[PDB]
Design a protein around this ligand. Sequence first.
Ligand SMILES: [Mg+2]
Ligand SMILES: [Mg+2]
Lengths: 412, 412
Amino acid sequence: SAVMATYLLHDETDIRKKAEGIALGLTIGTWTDLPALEQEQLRKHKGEVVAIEELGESERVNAYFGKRLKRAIVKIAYPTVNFSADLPALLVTTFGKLSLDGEVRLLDLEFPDEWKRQFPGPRFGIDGIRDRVGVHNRPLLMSIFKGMIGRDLAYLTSELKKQALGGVDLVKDDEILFDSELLPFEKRITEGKAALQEVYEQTGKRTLYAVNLTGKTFALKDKAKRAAELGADVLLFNVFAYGLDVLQALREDEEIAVPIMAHPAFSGAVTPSEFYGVAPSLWLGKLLRLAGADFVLFPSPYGSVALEREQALGIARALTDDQEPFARAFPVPSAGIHPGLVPLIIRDFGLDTIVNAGGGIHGHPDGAIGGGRAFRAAIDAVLAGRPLRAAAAENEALQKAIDRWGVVEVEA
Amino acid sequence: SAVMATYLLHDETDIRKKAEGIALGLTIGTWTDLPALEQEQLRKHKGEVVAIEELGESERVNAYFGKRLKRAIVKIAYPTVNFSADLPALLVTTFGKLSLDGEVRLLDLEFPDEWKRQFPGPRFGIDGIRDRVGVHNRPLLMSIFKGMIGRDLAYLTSELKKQALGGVDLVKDDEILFDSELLPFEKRITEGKAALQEVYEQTGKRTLYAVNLTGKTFALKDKAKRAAELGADVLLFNVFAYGLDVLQALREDEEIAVPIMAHPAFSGAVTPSEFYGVAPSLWLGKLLRLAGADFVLFPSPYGSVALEREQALGIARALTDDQEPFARAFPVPSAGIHPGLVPLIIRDFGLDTIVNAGGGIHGHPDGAIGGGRAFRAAIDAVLAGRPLRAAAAENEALQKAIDRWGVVEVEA
Ligand SMILES: [Mg+2]
Ligand SMILES: [Mg+2]
């Protein structure tokens, strides 16, 4: 039983020598000088280099570093008997001191099925969330509150209604919305709930509210329990600012048992480099799903700061792969989203995804209501097998969106 | 009252425009579309671009990216009334969504003194640690166990005594040493304490043991409290695998009140990039000191993976700057350390530093005892104003070390 870590290395010196050094150094430390009796005893703890895929030197990279760097993908097996069954131990064992060793980037971690079972996975996942909001088949639609910092509850309820009236399935707090006297955590939940039921009463639409769960680590479980008692729909959580283990703890607490939406804030401090850090498929995908996230918002492959398409798809695949002993986490491509992008979003990510209108929904000529109507009309068009403009001809909200932001061509 | 964040940005588009968009987008969202009542209401919550230092383009960077990237150091002010007084809120506000915005690297954070006072700083600091170990004036000396994974308590105590007999002031667990049936957390502490007291009786030397505090986040306080009851000397903590807030929580718990040694494990996933992440002076220095670390181990500016010298000095300055309302934290340059570097270490970092012999102390011809004597003799030589070779001619342990690793020139 061993966790196999896959790394990308750049180095002036022999890669194989470095790999062997890591396998031994990060496990038992010494081997050759140990008596036969000890070797047999410590055999089970010995790390091993599983594979080394030599890559071609990159002129671009060599020019950047001003030296000749050999490149290779290295796989190392770490016996699970070497560390405790928790994410902090996993990270320190596979990328602790090693993260300081020059150019090394963690690309993936493969866990033996038995080890994975010691972790929760999402409590609800895609299936559970779809039931909770009552929406099947079509992708979901969500938006974000705009300009709430410094505002009061009346403003919150008013803004929440507009978004719900626009037909969005879920509305979340801005990740930078923290608790205050004006907007207490518990009040956002209860006031928001009342407002959303009123909307159901009038339009027949069911909308959930993902409230930001913030503050100090050791106060999270108590407030989350309170949120659960108050009937909070979803808990938005800036996991990367707290640690993966905290997400897991929230997921495993039976007194909480509320869906958890993981926000990507701060993940960018770790994922972008070509030579260092941790790949997004692992940091935002595999690990967040295993830790308990029901929703995972990540950089979309569209817009001004689009994530490389294959990287974005890789995240979605890790979140939904049915080979994992966990429920699927909802992939939520975020940033650079507008109605004209719906056909591409569905083509790239499928129907089990969430169209995140973000705060941009408010930028529609007719406010959030018009913005939500445009998105819902666009989603229906794709499911009805029609081009957006065909639906736009019958839906003013959508036509206004198209004239404002256009339609992204999907024809290959 | 605002936290001023300093960033390094690379972008092919106008930097000031992007900076203004960040200051506004990450605070109140919109301004020019607000009525008078709302503007005066949200004025105090409005972020502002404090300054922009244009750096000019780099051909090396341009070649790497394959395009022209403008470069500038940007300072933005975020009103403290915008977020709760906790580190997770601080990180999310200043580098949450922003960490995903292309090429942005967080270099520093400056806070009003009143805001700083809401945080603990080290409980003991340099002065406190020197008292607890009983060593003043001279820099301290510490080492690490070698290959303890899979070993038993008989081996632990044996190796611990050898290091203490070498004259080291502190011995720490390997950061990858996790609790097991062979080496339970509480037993390492109690047996280690007994073994160390035997050494004092023999050589009159006092040696502390920094035990690894691991496991799940919500079990940390309980075991740390047990460690205190059992008389643990120092708690080694892989803070980056958890979160800054957890370190702060451990520091503020009056039922623990045991020195905390922060390990750099995983910090490398965040600090090395030229275009992304967080600068080490802030990530390993300023924030760890503010959060509560009494000792901070960080990449030394020596050896195969040496951290650029000014960066390393920057970390040490953040840890010891007397201008901060916190006790000074012990700077511990780590990696690439050998007796021949002692003169340079003292010249670079001063007397209030710790010479981290690491696991290399065991590589001395005469084991840890000889390795420790070599280091102690090296430190004494520098304080006595003598060349290492002069002292080596009178100290075998040191002579052996010098012949093996040599002496690094300290003359400017
Ligand atoms: Mg946001
Ligand atoms: Mg170590």
